[PDB]
Amino acid sequence: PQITLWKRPLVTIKIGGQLKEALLDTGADDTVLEEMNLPGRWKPKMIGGIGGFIKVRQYDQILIEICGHKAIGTVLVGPTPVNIIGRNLLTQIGCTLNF
């Protein structure tokens, strides 16, 4: 599909057996998901943006389906106000910017 940017590029994703809404975000190196209780090992991390830093848990090799496109990679989980699909996964679903 082609997504215009008049509105936030929100799409449905599937992660940890749950469906969620997330932004397709070319400004995020990595994917950041709102607080959820994923199983398995994780590593603490701090990520910075406008307003400062938030503490997140880094999970590796997490499977996510974005608009029916499967992807697997690093997912950071923490108190983000929004689910963010970052470039580490956007490359895997074949997403590009075009103008």
Next chain:
Amino acid sequence: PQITLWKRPLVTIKIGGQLKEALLDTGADDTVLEEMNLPGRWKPKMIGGIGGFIKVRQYDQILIEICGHKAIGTVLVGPTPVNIIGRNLLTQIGCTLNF
């Protein structure tokens, strides 16, 4: 152009007559640039990011060229970690996401 996402989508911009580098950021509603001198009146505003809220100067109807494409719109100036081009300007240059 078509821009892949294996690297950060960084582009050269011109604003106030000066060249700068900025990130094409589909997860940003607004365009936020690092502290700089811009001609024109401005008004104090607040914006929130992943880490909280910051004070910005809002410049309206500002001329800005992005990778050779002209836009005129709102530019917020403040302590952002990175120059980001948000959807208010990405729409003006005809930018879409595609997968």
